[PDB]
Design a protein around this ligand. Structure first.
Ligand SMILES: [Mg+2]
Ligand SMILES: [Mg+2]
Ligand SMILES: [Mg+2]
Ligand SMILES: [Mg+2]
Ligand SMILES: [Mg+2]
Ligand SMILES: [Mg+2]
Ligand SMILES: [Mg+2]
Ligand SMILES: [Mg+2]
Ligand SMILES: [Mg+2]
Ligand SMILES: [Mg+2]
Ligand SMILES: [Mg+2]
Ligand SMILES: [Mg+2]
Ligand SMILES: [Mg+2]
Ligand SMILES: [Mg+2]
Ligand SMILES: [Mg+2]
Ligand SMILES: [Mg+2]
Ligand SMILES: [Mg+2]
Ligand SMILES: [Mg+2]
Ligand SMILES: [Mg+2]
Ligand SMILES: [Mg+2]
Ligand SMILES: [Mg+2]
Ligand SMILES: [Mg+2]
Ligand SMILES: [Mg+2]
Ligand SMILES: [Mg+2]
Ligand SMILES: [Mg+2]
Ligand SMILES: [Mg+2]
Ligand SMILES: [Mg+2]
Ligand SMILES: [Mg+2]
Ligand SMILES: [Mg+2]
Ligand SMILES: [Mg+2]
Ligand SMILES: [Mg+2]
Ligand SMILES: [Mg+2]
Ligand SMILES: [Mg+2]
Ligand SMILES: [Mg+2]
Ligand SMILES: [Mg+2]
Ligand SMILES: [Mg+2]
Ligand SMILES: [Mg+2]
Ligand SMILES: [Mg+2]
Ligand SMILES: [Mg+2]
Ligand SMILES: [Mg+2]
Ligand SMILES: [Mg+2]
Ligand SMILES: [Mg+2]
Ligand SMILES: [Mg+2]
Ligand SMILES: [Mg+2]
Ligand SMILES: [Mg+2]
Ligand SMILES: [Mg+2]
Ligand SMILES: [Mg+2]
Ligand SMILES: [Mg+2]
Ligand SMILES: [Mg+2]
Ligand SMILES: [Mg+2]
Ligand SMILES: [Mg+2]
Ligand SMILES: [Mg+2]
Ligand SMILES: [Mg+2]
Ligand SMILES: [Mg+2]
Ligand SMILES: [Mg+2]
Ligand SMILES: [Mg+2]
Ligand SMILES: [Mg+2]
Ligand SMILES: [Mg+2]
Ligand SMILES: [Mg+2]
Ligand SMILES: [Mg+2]
Ligand SMILES: [Mg+2]
Ligand SMILES: [Mg+2]
Ligand SMILES: [Mg+2]
Ligand SMILES: [Mg+2]
Ligand SMILES: [Mg+2]
Ligand SMILES: [Mg+2]
Ligand SMILES: [Mg+2]
Ligand SMILES: [Mg+2]
Ligand SMILES: [Mg+2]
Ligand SMILES: [Mg+2]
Ligand SMILES: [Mg+2]
Ligand SMILES: [Mg+2]
Ligand SMILES: [Mg+2]
Ligand SMILES: [Mg+2]
Ligand SMILES: [Mg+2]
Ligand SMILES: [Mg+2]
Ligand SMILES: [Mg+2]
Ligand SMILES: [Mg+2]
Ligand SMILES: [Mg+2]
Ligand SMILES: [Mg+2]
Ligand SMILES: [Mg+2]
Ligand SMILES: [Mg+2]
Ligand SMILES: [Mg+2]
Ligand SMILES: [Mg+2]
Ligand SMILES: [Mg+2]
Ligand SMILES: [Mg+2]
Ligand SMILES: [Mg+2]
Ligand SMILES: [Mg+2]
Ligand SMILES: [Mg+2]
Ligand SMILES: [Mg+2]
Ligand SMILES: [Mg+2]
Ligand SMILES: [Mg+2]
Ligand SMILES: [Mg+2]
Ligand SMILES: [Mg+2]
Ligand SMILES: [Mg+2]
Ligand SMILES: [Mg+2]
Ligand SMILES: [Mg+2]
Ligand SMILES: [Mg+2]
Ligand SMILES: [Mg+2]
Ligand SMILES: [Mg+2]
Ligand SMILES: [Mg+2]
Ligand SMILES: [Mg+2]
Ligand SMILES: [Mg+2]
Ligand SMILES: [Mg+2]
Ligand SMILES: [Mg+2]
Ligand SMILES: [Mg+2]
Ligand SMILES: [Mg+2]
Ligand SMILES: [Mg+2]
Ligand SMILES: [Mg+2]
Ligand SMILES: [Mg+2]
Ligand SMILES: [Mg+2]
Ligand SMILES: [Mg+2]
Ligand SMILES: [Mg+2]
Ligand SMILES: [Mg+2]
Ligand SMILES: [Mg+2]
Ligand SMILES: [Mg+2]
Ligand SMILES: [Mg+2]
Ligand SMILES: [Mg+2]
Ligand SMILES: [Mg+2]
Ligand SMILES: [Mg+2]
Ligand SMILES: [Mg+2]
Ligand SMILES: [Mg+2]
Ligand SMILES: [Mg+2]
Ligand SMILES: [Mg+2]
Ligand SMILES: [Mg+2]
Ligand SMILES: [Mg+2]
Ligand SMILES: [Mg+2]
Ligand SMILES: [Mg+2]
Ligand SMILES: [Mg+2]
Ligand SMILES: [Mg+2]
Ligand SMILES: [Mg+2]
Ligand SMILES: [Mg+2]
Ligand SMILES: [Mg+2]
Ligand SMILES: [Mg+2]
Ligand SMILES: [Mg+2]
Ligand SMILES: [Mg+2]
Ligand SMILES: [Mg+2]
Ligand SMILES: [Mg+2]
Ligand SMILES: [Mg+2]
Ligand SMILES: [Mg+2]
Ligand SMILES: [Mg+2]
Ligand SMILES: [Mg+2]
Ligand SMILES: [Mg+2]
Ligand SMILES: [Mg+2]
Ligand SMILES: [Mg+2]
Ligand SMILES: [Mg+2]
Ligand SMILES: [Mg+2]
Ligand SMILES: [Mg+2]
Ligand SMILES: [Mg+2]
Ligand SMILES: [Mg+2]
Ligand SMILES: [Mg+2]
Ligand SMILES: [Mg+2]
Ligand SMILES: [Mg+2]
Ligand SMILES: [Mg+2]
Ligand SMILES: [Mg+2]
Ligand SMILES: [Mg+2]
Ligand SMILES: [Mg+2]
Ligand SMILES: [Mg+2]
Ligand SMILES: [Mg+2]
Ligand SMILES: [Mg+2]
Ligand SMILES: [Mg+2]
Ligand SMILES: [Mg+2]
Ligand SMILES: [Mg+2]
Ligand SMILES: [Mg+2]
Ligand SMILES: [Mg+2]
Ligand SMILES: [Mg+2]
Ligand SMILES: [Mg+2]
Ligand SMILES: [Mg+2]
Ligand SMILES: [Mg+2]
Ligand SMILES: [Mg+2]
Ligand SMILES: [Mg+2]
Ligand SMILES: [Mg+2]
Ligand SMILES: [Mg+2]
Ligand SMILES: [Mg+2]
Ligand SMILES: [Mg+2]
Ligand SMILES: [Mg+2]
Ligand SMILES: [Mg+2]
Ligand SMILES: [Mg+2]
Ligand SMILES: [Mg+2]
Ligand SMILES: [Mg+2]
Ligand SMILES: [Mg+2]
Ligand SMILES: [Mg+2]
Ligand SMILES: [Mg+2]
Ligand SMILES: [Mg+2]
Ligand SMILES: [Mg+2]
Ligand SMILES: [Mg+2]
Ligand SMILES: [Mg+2]
Ligand SMILES: [Mg+2]
Ligand SMILES: [Mg+2]
Ligand SMILES: [Mg+2]
Ligand SMILES: [Mg+2]
Ligand SMILES: [Mg+2]
Ligand SMILES: [Mg+2]
Ligand SMILES: [Mg+2]
Ligand SMILES: [Mg+2]
Ligand SMILES: [Mg+2]
Ligand SMILES: [Mg+2]
Ligand SMILES: [Mg+2]
Ligand SMILES: [Mg+2]
Ligand SMILES: [Mg+2]
Ligand SMILES: [Mg+2]
Ligand SMILES: [Mg+2]
Ligand SMILES: [Mg+2]
Ligand SMILES: [Mg+2]
Ligand SMILES: [Mg+2]
Ligand SMILES: [Mg+2]
Ligand SMILES: [Mg+2]
Ligand SMILES: [Mg+2]
Ligand SMILES: [Mg+2]
Ligand SMILES: [Mg+2]
Ligand SMILES: [Mg+2]
Ligand SMILES: [Mg+2]
Ligand SMILES: [Mg+2]
Ligand SMILES: [Mg+2]
Ligand SMILES: [Mg+2]
Ligand SMILES: [Mg+2]
Ligand SMILES: [Mg+2]
Ligand SMILES: [Mg+2]
Ligand SMILES: [Mg+2]
Ligand SMILES: [Mg+2]
Ligand SMILES: [Mg+2]
Ligand SMILES: [Mg+2]
Ligand SMILES: [Mg+2]
Ligand SMILES: [Mg+2]
Ligand SMILES: [Mg+2]
Ligand SMILES: [Mg+2]
Ligand SMILES: [Mg+2]
Ligand SMILES: [Mg+2]
Ligand SMILES: [Mg+2]
Ligand SMILES: [Mg+2]
Ligand SMILES: [Mg+2]
Ligand SMILES: [Mg+2]
Ligand SMILES: [Mg+2]
Ligand SMILES: [Mg+2]
Ligand SMILES: [Mg+2]
Ligand SMILES: [Mg+2]
Ligand SMILES: [Mg+2]
Ligand SMILES: [Mg+2]
Ligand SMILES: [Mg+2]
Ligand SMILES: [Mg+2]
Ligand SMILES: [Mg+2]
Ligand SMILES: [Mg+2]
Ligand SMILES: [Mg+2]
Ligand SMILES: [Mg+2]
Ligand SMILES: [Mg+2]
Ligand SMILES: [Mg+2]
Ligand SMILES: [Mg+2]
Ligand SMILES: [Mg+2]
Ligand SMILES: [Mg+2]
Ligand SMILES: [Mg+2]
Ligand SMILES: [Mg+2]
Ligand SMILES: [Mg+2]
Ligand SMILES: [Mg+2]
Ligand SMILES: [Mg+2]
Ligand SMILES: [Mg+2]
Ligand SMILES: [Mg+2]
Ligand SMILES: [Mg+2]
Ligand SMILES: [Mg+2]
Ligand SMILES: [Mg+2]
Ligand SMILES: [Zn+2]
Lengths: 204, 59, 118, 122, 16, 131
RNA sequence: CGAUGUCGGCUCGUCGCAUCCUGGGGCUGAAGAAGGUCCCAAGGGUUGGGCUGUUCGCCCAUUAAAGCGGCACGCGAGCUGGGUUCAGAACGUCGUGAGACAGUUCGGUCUCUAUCCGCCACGGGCGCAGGAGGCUUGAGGGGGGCUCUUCCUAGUACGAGAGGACCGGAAGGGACGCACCUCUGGUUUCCCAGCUGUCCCUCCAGGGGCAUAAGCUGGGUAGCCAUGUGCGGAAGGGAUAACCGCUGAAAGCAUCUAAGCGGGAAGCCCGCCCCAAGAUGAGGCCUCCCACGGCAGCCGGUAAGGACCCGGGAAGACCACCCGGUGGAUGGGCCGGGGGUGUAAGCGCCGCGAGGCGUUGAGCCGACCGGUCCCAAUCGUCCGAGGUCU
RNA sequence: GAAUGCCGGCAUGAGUAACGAUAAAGAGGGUGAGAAUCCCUCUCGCCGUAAGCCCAAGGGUUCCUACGCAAUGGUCGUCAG
RNA sequence: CGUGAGGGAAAGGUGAAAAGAACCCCGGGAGGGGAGUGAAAUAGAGCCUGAAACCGUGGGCUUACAAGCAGUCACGGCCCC
């Protein structure tokens, strides 16, 4: 179960066998192994990774001493891939090759305080026939005296997006090792320049 | 609507409980490197008129 | 939402917002320094810097251009004759926005000054 | 994007001219039909003494839509009207001719006799 | 479903 | 990093330059590759280019035609490998940049509104003299 | 009865199962296919119309199916107001009359402000025995759970024929979900162009305001979007329901059970996605500071750190989050590219002229990909450990 | 100690709704103990069969100056019916 | 308040004597702090007495794993006499 840290860069389409395949491009590589989680000391099995070189100025003291014990220069992000122990001490895009199949995890685009129609695909009220100031309003939220209360988890308006989202079974279309590029046919969570994670798929 | 009205007069305790978040935060201030007078940061010194080490306006 | 949008609305509609910027360009280019509210000030920088740059060009097209926002041929002459020469080598950044320490009394609005650079 | 109440032009010598879709024959609850889908339609305007008459209830397949259709090669295509072709239960045309281009998508959906009889497969 | 139609007990509210 | 550079980089392998330039109004003929049952054909779609929307590699132009009594509009990506060749068949003068308005016009009205761009015709024939 | 607003609709659901479909079964007057009927099963699904206020019902066209009920006949401090309770008016009928009718008819005031519980979101505080920066385990929650058609097997098994499989393996859809903007398609309040009336600048040309909170019209980037695109429902392991067994007595036979062991559902437990140590049972690992001055407590100065303040941001109501703060590309400007608009003004020439031609894909030009210290993030300040007890 | 009691005082809701047409504002200069709000200027916008002007009714010093800012003005006030 | 007939309030108290607070200081004024008066100035004119609800500052005890008509009975802890 292999993973890699990366940044979403932007979408395009290419042509493969006279078919148009819309891809998103992810600057994945390279990710230096900064720490290894072993059952003896930690309990599970995982690898702490690193992304984006950082100003050794910007990196504070306790962080600095951490990076150093591993031999890594300061890097902007630490994230762990679970159940992963690569042979080397640095991960590149070349742990995927075209035809594979990935799960991609990012932070979705935040829609802030979203209405009930945007957030929950509700249908609001009529826009004529006497409908009165309720065109985007949810409707009834409960019953009457029995139960006399509102179900926990009731779909109401509130913040939507800027949450973790994982998309599954995405075809690895091509890998550009030199420029550390990973191609993936489909839609990846989040904005361009957003941090993402690319693991091997859970599906089969 | 049907004119939502309050049910019970709120307690002394409860309204003060509501107001635990009402304390003003005192103005944040720094000494002006030229005339030593306590002024707001990132603002032209209102008591000698200096900012960024030079004279900017008249005070 | 507002994602990746440029420019405040400043609680004015489309013509009023444009007028607001024009009259301030008129004022700023006339006195070389004006006090305003801090949001307005930051907004003034570019609207004016475009005009100074077009002044730096000097061709007849540019003057006729600036005229649409400033309307004043004497003023525009100050812009091409006296103001623009000061900037032949300055690569943009012809304006400065400094924040003032005290506030308006009637609404505590925070104030700033906008002047033209030396 | 044809859906119930959509009027369509008939593109054969079945004597119809306008048909009004009343169901898309695509499973339980399909929203719209495109090029290559059957529909059940009501004849709304016909010509005297023809294969079909006003007020009939006839199946028909849609041959060109005014909504564009995307294609896997990145292309697309849209026509200037919405037209269908009347058929019998065995998906065969109930007339003898076809009038105006039809989308090549009809071939992949198995409407051979319509593609062949069309003046331009696009 | 109650087969026998049920008459209102209250008038539609009117200003008094 | 430069996200825009990286994207233009992926787009490279697929970019064409063999295609003759054209503008809206120019009547044109696209030789396009289709598959019919099994075989593969070159089918020609020929008509006035009515829109040209650009996004670099993702630019796409729409081509209006009239076929046996029906109007056919047809969108093509300007870098598709299914486009064998494009031959200009007539240069026209568009005072507009998206010609959607010709959808609503008769023949004698469109001919009146898209006269031959004689300026570019003269240049066409002035090119092609690669002696 | 010092008021518990009353049909139907819309919206939002939630539960029961006496199950409409999907799944698993026994019996069949079950050849096959297809039905009948009983048992298990509530996981998911359960269409669009015509008529009527209608619930209901009939009908049209589909469907895997078009389930029945509870929730104050759920839901009027959520909406409607067609039905039905007011006053007006009329028809039939009744009454000498005023008037009246589970008889019909046309019309007819639906109340901006949520205190408490509840619910959706977001913080502030304290706690988690030293103070800190990171990275995590996942107790326990939530979300998801659908299904069709065609082909191959095979026109085989079965059947006189018509008709037509179990199992096994392919591909293609419908509806829903999460995400996304490459494409298709919207918008794009001033990004470009055109046009009318009027007032103006400056007479011409060129421009400006106003005609909407864009005057109108043709276009349109980023963004936000669906009609567009990607992906999901599983696989698989475990324990099971009805039901089917192995071995097997009580009961020399028989018996699925009394001892024991199997097989067996869309169902239950894992598994997938998401939240989560306020899990006070307050967890774990990696790294950093460390015995500071005075009378398990106090008062200070500090440490590593943090905070204020500032430039900001596809983060956002405020708060928060995240980036940057000159040792810096954070915003603004500027420059290059993109993109839109589609050939500016000016001049030259052609025409009596409205115009036309060239210069010229010109000019202008939001946000998009970048560069650039020209402008602004100056300068600083305040909190912040000395670690209880066997 | 209660009469939806009577009179007055003071609470709650709450720093909440609101602050009265979406015709509109910006800067400079001045006065002053104090200025988004008063005065001057320039700019921008609104009315123009009026949102201009003159009569009548009705109101009754609201007119004009000077000096004031406790209250009145929905904020402010140096200004004002 | 009502066109009108007509309805119809609220509101008393410095001290024996004004001896009603010169003068100084902060402030634009209001207001206050000293000085002075007085037997007394929380008798200072918003003035005899000055209750209660209501608001506030300071101190003692207590409170952030807790279920409530708020008390009550017991016990323990801290503070006070
Ligand atoms: Mg983009
Ligand atoms: Mg390839
Ligand atoms: Mg992440
Ligand atoms: Mg985001
Ligand atoms: Mg947002
Ligand atoms: Mg959304
Ligand atoms: Mg949504
Ligand atoms: Mg929606
Ligand atoms: Mg709806
Ligand atoms: Mg709607
Ligand atoms: Mg609806
Ligand atoms: Mg209404
Ligand atoms: Mg409405
Ligand atoms: Mg409402
Ligand atoms: Mg509602
Ligand atoms: Mg209850
Ligand atoms: Mg959020
Ligand atoms: Mg999600
Ligand atoms: Mg797949
Ligand atoms: Mg309401
Ligand atoms: Mg209302
Ligand atoms: Mg109300
Ligand atoms: Mg009560
Ligand atoms: Mg109370
Ligand atoms: Mg109390
Ligand atoms: Mg209190
Ligand atoms: Mg409270
Ligand atoms: Mg509050
Ligand atoms: Mg404070
Ligand atoms: Mg929104
Ligand atoms: Mg909005
Ligand atoms: Mg920006
Ligand atoms: Mg703007
Ligand atoms: Mg506003
Ligand atoms: Mg406003
Ligand atoms: Mg305003
Ligand atoms: Mg406002
Ligand atoms: Mg306007
Ligand atoms: Mg000023
Ligand atoms: Mg700009
Ligand atoms: Mg000149
Ligand atoms: Mg301009
Ligand atoms: Mg004020
Ligand atoms: Mg003031
Ligand atoms: Mg400030
Ligand atoms: Mg036809
Ligand atoms: Mg015909
Ligand atoms: Mg008829
Ligand atoms: Mg007829
Ligand atoms: Mg043919
Ligand atoms: Mg031919
Ligand atoms: Mg009432
Ligand atoms: Mg790009
Ligand atoms: Mg685009
Ligand atoms: Mg044509
Ligand atoms: Mg012409
Ligand atoms: Mg020409
Ligand atoms: Mg009652
Ligand atoms: Mg009551
Ligand atoms: Mg009541
Ligand atoms: Mg009540
Ligand atoms: Mg009913
Ligand atoms: Mg049962
Ligand atoms: Mg079954
Ligand atoms: Mg069944
Ligand atoms: Mg039989
Ligand atoms: Mg059978
Ligand atoms: Mg059965
Ligand atoms: Mg169920
Ligand atoms: Mg129905
Ligand atoms: Mg009808
Ligand atoms: Mg109906
Ligand atoms: Mg009905
Ligand atoms: Mg009925
Ligand atoms: Mg069936
Ligand atoms: Mg059926
Ligand atoms: Mg029911
Ligand atoms: Mg129900
Ligand atoms: Mg009941
Ligand atoms: Mg009820
Ligand atoms: Mg009810
Ligand atoms: Mg309700
Ligand atoms: Mg109801
Ligand atoms: Mg109501
Ligand atoms: Mg109702
Ligand atoms: Mg209610
Ligand atoms: Mg109620
Ligand atoms: Mg009614
Ligand atoms: Mg009504
Ligand atoms: Mg009625
Ligand atoms: Mg009679
Ligand atoms: Mg009688
Ligand atoms: Mg009698
Ligand atoms: Mg009646
Ligand atoms: Mg009745
Ligand atoms: Mg009636
Ligand atoms: Mg009426
Ligand atoms: Mg209202
Ligand atoms: Mg509340
Ligand atoms: Mg409470
Ligand atoms: Mg309560
Ligand atoms: Mg917290
Ligand atoms: Mg510890
Ligand atoms: Mg600690
Ligand atoms: Mg930490
Ligand atoms: Mg932190
Ligand atoms: Mg975790
Ligand atoms: Mg769990
Ligand atoms: Mg819990
Ligand atoms: Mg679960
Ligand atoms: Mg399921
Ligand atoms: Mg066969
Ligand atoms: Mg066989
Ligand atoms: Mg047969
Ligand atoms: Mg099968
Ligand atoms: Mg569903
Ligand atoms: Mg969605
Ligand atoms: Mg999205
Ligand atoms: Mg998006
Ligand atoms: Mg884009
Ligand atoms: Mg488009
Ligand atoms: Mg688009
Ligand atoms: Mg402009
Ligand atoms: Mg005219
Ligand atoms: Mg004009
Ligand atoms: Mg002119
Ligand atoms: Mg001209
Ligand atoms: Mg004007
Ligand atoms: Mg006007
Ligand atoms: Mg206007
Ligand atoms: Mg209009
Ligand atoms: Mg305009
Ligand atoms: Mg437009
Ligand atoms: Mg558009
Ligand atoms: Mg756009
Ligand atoms: Mg866009
Ligand atoms: Mg869609
Ligand atoms: Mg889709
Ligand atoms: Mg699917
Ligand atoms: Mg399973
Ligand atoms: Mg046996
Ligand atoms: Mg035996
Ligand atoms: Mg046996
Ligand atoms: Mg047993
Ligand atoms: Mg077993
Ligand atoms: Mg077995
Ligand atoms: Mg088993
Ligand atoms: Mg399944
Ligand atoms: Mg997590
Ligand atoms: Mg913890
Ligand atoms: Mg945690
Ligand atoms: Mg517990
Ligand atoms: Mg505890
Ligand atoms: Mg503990
Ligand atoms: Mg512990
Ligand atoms: Mg911990
Ligand atoms: Mg542990
Ligand atoms: Mg914020
Ligand atoms: Mg912000
Ligand atoms: Mg704030
Ligand atoms: Mg703050
Ligand atoms: Mg951080
Ligand atoms: Mg920082
Ligand atoms: Mg600093
Ligand atoms: Mg910093
Ligand atoms: Mg920068
Ligand atoms: Mg940077
Ligand atoms: Mg820049
Ligand atoms: Mg900005
Ligand atoms: Mg370009
Ligand atoms: Mg271009
Ligand atoms: Mg020209
Ligand atoms: Mg020209
Ligand atoms: Mg010209
Ligand atoms: Mg001439
Ligand atoms: Mg021309
Ligand atoms: Mg251009
Ligand atoms: Mg420009
Ligand atoms: Mg450019
Ligand atoms: Mg540099
Ligand atoms: Mg300093
Ligand atoms: Mg009593
Ligand atoms: Mg009362
Ligand atoms: Mg009462
Ligand atoms: Mg009483
Ligand atoms: Mg009373
Ligand atoms: Mg009273
Ligand atoms: Mg009294
Ligand atoms: Mg009272
Ligand atoms: Mg009272
Ligand atoms: Mg009071
Ligand atoms: Mg109180
Ligand atoms: Mg009060
Ligand atoms: Mg209350
Ligand atoms: Mg209050
Ligand atoms: Mg306040
Ligand atoms: Mg507030
Ligand atoms: Mg409130
Ligand atoms: Mg209010
Ligand atoms: Mg009001
Ligand atoms: Mg407000
Ligand atoms: Mg109001
Ligand atoms: Mg009005
Ligand atoms: Mg107003
Ligand atoms: Mg309006
Ligand atoms: Mg100004
Ligand atoms: Mg002014
Ligand atoms: Mg004064
Ligand atoms: Mg003042
Ligand atoms: Mg002003
Ligand atoms: Mg001023
Ligand atoms: Mg003022
Ligand atoms: Mg004002
Ligand atoms: Mg004035
Ligand atoms: Mg001026
Ligand atoms: Mg006039
Ligand atoms: Mg007016
Ligand atoms: Mg008089
Ligand atoms: Mg009066
Ligand atoms: Mg006053
Ligand atoms: Mg005063
Ligand atoms: Mg006075
Ligand atoms: Mg007042
Ligand atoms: Mg006042
Ligand atoms: Mg008032
Ligand atoms: Mg006067
Ligand atoms: Mg009166
Ligand atoms: Mg009276
Ligand atoms: Mg009177
Ligand atoms: Mg009376
Ligand atoms: Mg008294
Ligand atoms: Mg006396
Ligand atoms: Mg005495
Ligand atoms: Mg004095
Ligand atoms: Mg003084
Ligand atoms: Mg003095
Ligand atoms: Mg004064
Ligand atoms: Mg005094
Ligand atoms: Mg004092
Ligand atoms: Mg005194
Ligand atoms: Mg004495
Ligand atoms: Mg005294
Ligand atoms: Mg006393
Ligand atoms: Mg006394
Ligand atoms: Mg008193
Ligand atoms: Mg006495
Ligand atoms: Mg007293
Ligand atoms: Mg007193
Ligand atoms: Mg008292
Ligand atoms: Mg106290
Ligand atoms: Mg205390
Ligand atoms: Mg307690
Ligand atoms: Mg516990
Ligand atoms: Mg405790
Ligand atoms: Mg307690
Ligand atoms: Mg209890
Ligand atoms: Mg109790
Ligand atoms: Mg009590
Ligand atoms: Mg005891
Ligand atoms: Zn200073």
């Amino acid at each position: 179960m292999k993973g890699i840290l990366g940044v979403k860069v932007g979408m395009t389409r290419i042509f493969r066998d006279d078919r148009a395949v819309p891809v998103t491009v992810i600057l994945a590589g390279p990710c230096p192994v900064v720490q290894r989680r072993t059952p003896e000391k930690d309990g599970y099995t995982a690898v702490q990774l690193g992304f984006l070189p950082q100003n050794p100025k910007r990196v504070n003291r306790p962080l600095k001493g951490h990076f150093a014990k591993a031999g890594v220069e300061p890097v902007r992000i630490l994230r762990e891939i679970r159940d992963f122990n690569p042979e080397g001490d640095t991960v590149t895009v070349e742990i995927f090759k075209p035809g594979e199949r990935v799960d991609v995890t990012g932070t979705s685009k935040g829609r802030g305080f979203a209405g009930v129609m945007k957030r929950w695909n509700f249908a609001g009220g009529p826009d004529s026939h006497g409908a009165h100031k309720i065109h985007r309003h949810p409707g009834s939220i409960g019953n009457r005296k029995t139960p006399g209360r509102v179900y926990k988890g009731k779909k109401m308006a509130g913040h939507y997006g800027a949450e973790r989202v994982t998309v599954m079974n995405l075809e690895v279309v091509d890998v550009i090792p030199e420029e550390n590029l990973l191609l993936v046919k489909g839609a990846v969570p989040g904005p361009n320049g957003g941090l993402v994670i690319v693991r091997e798929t859970k599906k089969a | 609507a049907k004119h939502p009205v309050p049910k019970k007069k709120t307690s002394k305790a409860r309204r003060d409980a509501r107001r635990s978040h009402h304390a003003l935060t005192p103005p944040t201030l720094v000494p002006c490197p030229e005339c030593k007078a306590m002024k707001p940061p990132h603002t032209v010194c209102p008591e000698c008129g200096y900012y960024a080490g030079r004279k900017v306006l008249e005070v | 939402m507002r994602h990746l949008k440029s420019g405040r609305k400043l609680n004015r509609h489309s013509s009023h917002r444009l007028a607001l910027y024009r009259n301030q360009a008129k004022s700023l280019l006339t006195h070389g320094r004006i006090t305003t509210t801090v949001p307005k000030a930051k907004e003034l920088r570019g609207f004016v810097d475009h005009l100074i740059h077009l002044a730096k060009r000097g061709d007849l097209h540019a003057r006729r251009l600036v005229l649409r926002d400033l309307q004043d041929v004497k003023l525009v002459r100050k812009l091409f004759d006296e103001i623009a020469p000061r900037y032949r080598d300055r690569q943009g950044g012809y304006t400065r926005v400094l924040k003032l320490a005290e506030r308006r009394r009637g609404d505590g609005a925070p104030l700033a000054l906008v002047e033209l650079v030396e | 994007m044809i859906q119930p109440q959509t009027y369509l032009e008939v593109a054969d010598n079945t004597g119809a001219r306008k048909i009004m879709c009343i169901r898309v024959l695509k499973g339980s609850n399909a929203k719209y039909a495109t090029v290559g889908d059957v529909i059940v339609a009501s004849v709304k305007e016909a010509i005297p003494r023809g294969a079909v008459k006003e007020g009939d209830v006839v199946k028909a397949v849609v041959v060109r839509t005014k909504k564009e259709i995307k294609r896997p090669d990145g292309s697309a295509i849209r026509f200037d009207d919405n037209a269908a072709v009347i058929i019998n239960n065995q998906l065969e045309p109930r007339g003898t001719r076809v009038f105006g281009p039809v989308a090549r998508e009809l071939r992949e959906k198995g409407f051979m006799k319509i593609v062949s009889l069309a003046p331009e497969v696009l | 479903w109650r087969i026998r139609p049920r008459p209102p007990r209250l008038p539609r509210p009117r200003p008094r | 990093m430069n996200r825009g550079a990286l994207i233009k980089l992926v787009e490279s392998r697929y970019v064409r330059t063999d295609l003759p330039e054209f503008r809206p109004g120019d009547t044109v003929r696209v030789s396009y590759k289709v598959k019919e049952g099994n075989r593969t054909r070159i089918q020609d779609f020929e008509g006035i280019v009515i829109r040209i929307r650009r996004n670099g590699f993702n630019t796409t132009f729409t081509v209006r035609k009239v076929s046996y009594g029906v109007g056919v509009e047809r969108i093509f990506p300007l870098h598709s490998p299914l486009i064998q060749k494009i031959d200009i068949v007539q240069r026209g003068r568009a005072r507009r940049a998206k010609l959607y308005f010709i959808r609503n016009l008769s023949d004698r009205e469109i001919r009146r509104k898209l006269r031959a761009d004689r300026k570019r015709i003269d240049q066409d024939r002035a090119a092609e003299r690669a002696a």
